[PDB]
Enzyme design. Structure first.
Site, PDB file in Angstrom:
ATOM      1  N   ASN A 233      27.413  49.636  39.904  1.00 16.33           N
ATOM      2  CA  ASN A 233      26.589  48.476  40.258  1.00 16.33           C
ATOM      3  C   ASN A 233      27.384  47.581  41.213  1.00 16.33           C
ATOM      4  O   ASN A 233      28.449  47.987  41.711  1.00 16.33           O
ATOM      5  CB  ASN A 233      26.142  47.706  39.013  1.00 16.33           C
ATOM      6  CG  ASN A 233      27.285  46.987  38.334  1.00 16.33           C
ATOM      7  OD1 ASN A 233      28.358  47.563  38.165  1.00 16.33           O
ATOM      8  ND2 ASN A 233      27.073  45.741  37.948  1.00 16.33           N
ATOM      9  N   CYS A 235      29.132  44.902  40.635  1.00 10.47           N
ATOM     10  CA  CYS A 235      30.443  44.445  40.125  1.00 10.47           C
ATOM     11  C   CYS A 235      31.314  45.604  39.604  1.00 10.47           C
ATOM     12  O   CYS A 235      32.443  45.377  39.154  1.00 10.47           O
ATOM     13  CB  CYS A 235      30.216  43.380  39.063  1.00 10.47           C
ATOM     14  SG  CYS A 235      29.398  41.927  39.773  1.00 10.47           S
ATOM     15  N   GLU A 237      31.189  47.836  37.106  1.00 10.08           N
ATOM     16  CA  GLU A 237      31.456  48.082  35.679  1.00 10.08           C
ATOM     17  C   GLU A 237      30.323  48.875  35.006  1.00 10.08           C
ATOM     18  O   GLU A 237      30.515  49.340  33.890  1.00 10.08           O
ATOM     19  CB  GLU A 237      31.661  46.762  34.935  1.00 10.08           C
ATOM     20  CG  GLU A 237      30.379  46.089  34.467  1.00 10.08           C
ATOM     21  CD  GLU A 237      29.634  45.265  35.511  1.00 10.08           C
ATOM     22  OE1 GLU A 237      29.766  45.563  36.725  1.00 10.08           O
ATOM     23  OE2 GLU A 237      28.921  44.311  35.106  1.00 10.08           O
TER      24      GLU A 237
END
Lengths: 504, 504
Positions: A233, A235, A237
């Site tokens: 995604n 970010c 994670e």
């Protein structure tokens, strides 16, 4: 104590669209927990969810704050699209991203399936559509491409001075075979790799997605059904599979490790998972009929992927005078993450007993394909008493570190002269003769900590997290490139699934 | 004479996508005409269609050449979308434009319904990026009384983020009248419009009320507003949220008017166009993104029979472009053609029945006629004059054939006189060897009174149920008072649109 964290600093943060017009913080929490309990058909749990948030045991992401309990608001903001090789599919997925963005979503896409330039235009060329959409519709989109893709060199230029793509974040998907052949001395691959390291030095990007570490260590059910996780995604994670007709989606919340001792022997983790299953249900019911969110809706229904994370990890260490480096934090990592993951697992099994398995998990005995993921939590951390973000150590002691304060008072040294010296030394206390090596080690900053130790700790943590973790590294520019290279290789070899921004 | 027009120059043009691999021109005409007759359920008409094309009485759009009679090829290349003020709708139309472009279409959109500033022009940027990404030309239309009009007029200026979109402004009667009567704001806007056309050629002008007051009665009765035109500004059809206008184009060669005026050429040309449109409908059934186009074609069956070699036809009869005789000729010819087209569309209704919109109106097509630029069409047919435009030059390496013949019978078809014509920029106004009458006949575009061009276009427009691509030649020399008066005359005389402004 209840609402200990609500002050002028957190009130300001919450006033940037976390609260509806005329709403108090307490009122919002009640709105959100009432709704979560309604979606579970268990209004009795309402007060337990309230207590969790008020006491600051569990923080909730901003889309949950703003939307949960409203009629139409969508309490998820983490999307990914798989981008097909045909123009009609690209067009449909551009739509998904446009609408996902509109509702407040962070977005991402895997482009590795796209034809290279000069075939019966290229992958990067099509990323311009997504770039323009981000500029049009305060949005954030991460484009992911495989490193052995022919347009990789073009892809690495994104966000250079001059480059027509300025709005997209990037991540590269690096498989094992590619990595080994690069170590063993493939000249083509080494020049690409030097460009990656060069790019991460200059711009902080791209993110690294270690494809085989991600797929080696994913839920059995994804192995059994041969659903590949192709990208992460925004970010870096979230570790879920996206397909032509399924767009992965995840609800985030974090357990506050600073207060581990308060909640560790309660049903806190269990209710957090019940809570997140409720948030997902609210998204699901609100998106029935929505053309462009169909693929997200369908993923949610079939997988029910949850992403329970942590924050305040460094704060917990400092609270117990445990240094970040060394064996004691590593073992404590094992203690806490074994404990949480086990309880999250049992909560998911409990959810299956009560509400049934969704279609993909029939026979598997659990409600959710995934339970845990460690997000950046920049805002949640600040909201919650300026705690350390996620599993990242604090950048500084003064930019004023609470646990350093109380130590300094014990030694008498909580004065303006000492803090002035800390400010002049860049938030470090490593210059102080009045501190033991043990005390200095506890209050080392992100810079001063061994990046190698961070990676080793990540590796140990990763064994207990079924998704991923936003892992920033602080590598000085003056530190040699050969040493940066060893650090990447160590991350890869110790099972780290991804690397986020590179700070300097 | 059959295939008189096929030579080296016209074969070079046809070899850039008109012919399939290993195909002869004769074979392509046969594939096309076979297909058109099949779609009518009248195989006996095939040889009539072949005769019309081989003899060069009728030219066919390039999309018809490459696609008609193939399995999947779409023989239409003219599309328009209404862009709604909701983002889900903007996304759908973006989709339409992307797919329409993919299959070889020129495209356009009306944006006037979009809210003021991220605003109308902000969203155009998406369509711009699509043009620069998909294997194309798009015309964006905005009303002049739209608040973002000033941003819109900056499109294709040095530095502007939008460089690929052509533009056209929609100008109502009330606005022109208030502007004339001394509204200062209006005049400020009008000045920028004129300055833009002077320096860039853009935007096109769409006279909203001229277009809508003189459209088919069926559109007035159903309250279907024509909001905008196409890429080339000759197509005058209503687009809505669920219908996207398309039109199939072909042209009568006015150079050979004496040959076909008393045949059933125009009737057969209308039959052929209805057939082409039927081929489009049947091939797009089930195509998601061409759905709104498919629906328009089904319900309206709008046709666009044009003309070319207007100037050539005049010069063949030694008629000057300026003066009463050309005006009367305009009346004789276009009355004749429009009356035959109306009757053929009535005969089609008798044979095949009326589409939904035209129940009770006793014809098969809402519109029958529209005059395109026909740049490629006229070059193919013995380098005859394009559309209703005068030749730019008598020698540009093509010699004007009727001039050549006029000099031929004066022993003046020598390198000396042609060298003199070349040095005078393709003009013969320098030659004392020609009478005044003969000079009038061979005046070029820039030498002809632009007022006369407009006045002739006004007379012509009464016989054309759609519009006509009308270029003007305005020199930088000319005062802005004079340019202004020219725009007002066009408006006053019922001209529906102005295309490019050329600056020789």
């Amino acid at each position: 104590t209840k609402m200990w964290w609500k002050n002028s600093e957190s009130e300001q943060i919450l006033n940037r669209g976390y609260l509806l017009k005329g709403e108090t913080v307490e009122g919002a929490i009640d709105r959100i927990c009432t709704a979560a309990a309604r979606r579970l058909y268990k209004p009795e749990l309402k007060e337990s969810f309230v207590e969790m948030i008020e006491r600051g045991w569990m923080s909730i992401s901003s889309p949950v704050w703003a939307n949960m309990g409203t009629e139409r608001g969508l309490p998820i903001s983490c999307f990914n699209v798989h981008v097909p090789d045909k123009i009609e599919g690209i067009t449909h997925k551009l739509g998904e991203v446009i609408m996902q963005t509109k509702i407040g979503g962070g977005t991402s896409g895997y482009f590795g399936e796209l034809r290279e330039r000069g075939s019966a235009s290229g992958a990067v060329s099509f990323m311009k559509l997504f770039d323009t959409a981000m500029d049009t519709i305060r949005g954030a989109f991460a484009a992911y491409l495989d490193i052995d893709h022919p347009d990789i060199e073009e892809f690495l230029k994104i966000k250079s001075i001059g480059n027509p793509i300025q709005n997209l974040f990037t991540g590269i998907c690096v498989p094992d075979y590619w990595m080994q052949e690069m170590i063993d001395g493939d000249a083509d691959k080494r020049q690409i790799w030097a460009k990656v390291l060069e790019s991460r030095q200059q711009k902080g990007l791209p993110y690294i997605f270690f494809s085989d570490n991600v797929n080696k260590n994913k839920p059995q059910v994804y192995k059994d059904q041969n659903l590949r996780i192709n990208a992460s995604n925004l970010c870096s994670e979230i570790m879920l599979p996206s397909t032509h007709d399924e767009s992965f989606i995840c609800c985030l919340s974090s357990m506050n490790l600073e207060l581990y001792e308060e909640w560790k022997d309660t049903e806190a983790v269990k209710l957090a998972i019940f809570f997140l299953d409720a948030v997902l249900q609210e998204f699901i019911e609100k998106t029935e009929g929505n053309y462009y969110l169909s693929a997200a809706n369908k993923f949610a229904k079939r997988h029910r992927a949850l992403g329970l994370g942590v924050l305040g990890w460094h704060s917990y260490l400092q609270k117990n005078m445990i240094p970040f480096e060394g064996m004691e934090a590593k073992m404590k990592t094992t203690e806490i993450f074994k404990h949480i993951s086990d309880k999250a697992d049992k909560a998911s099994q409990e959810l299956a007993r009560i509400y049934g398995e969704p279609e993909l998990l029939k026979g598997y005995g659990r409600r959710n394909t995934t339970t845990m993921a460690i997000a950046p939590t920049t805002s949640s951390s600040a909201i919650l008493g300026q705690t350390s973000p996620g599993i990242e150590p604090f950048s500084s002691n003064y930019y004023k570190n609470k646990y350093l304060k109380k130590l300094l008072e014990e030694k008498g040294l909580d004065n303006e002269e000492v803090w002035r010296g800390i400010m002049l030394n860049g938030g470090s206390v490593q210059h102080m003769s009045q501190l033991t090596q043990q005390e200095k080690d506890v209050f080392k900053t992100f810079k001063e900590i061994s990046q190698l130790e961070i990676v080793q700790q990540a590796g140990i943590r990763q064994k207990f997290v079924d998704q991923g973790q936003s892992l920033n590294l602080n590598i000085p520019a003056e530190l040699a490139i050969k040493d940066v290279n060893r650090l990447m290789i160590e991350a890869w070899q110790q099972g780290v699934k991804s690397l986020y921004y590179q700070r300097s």
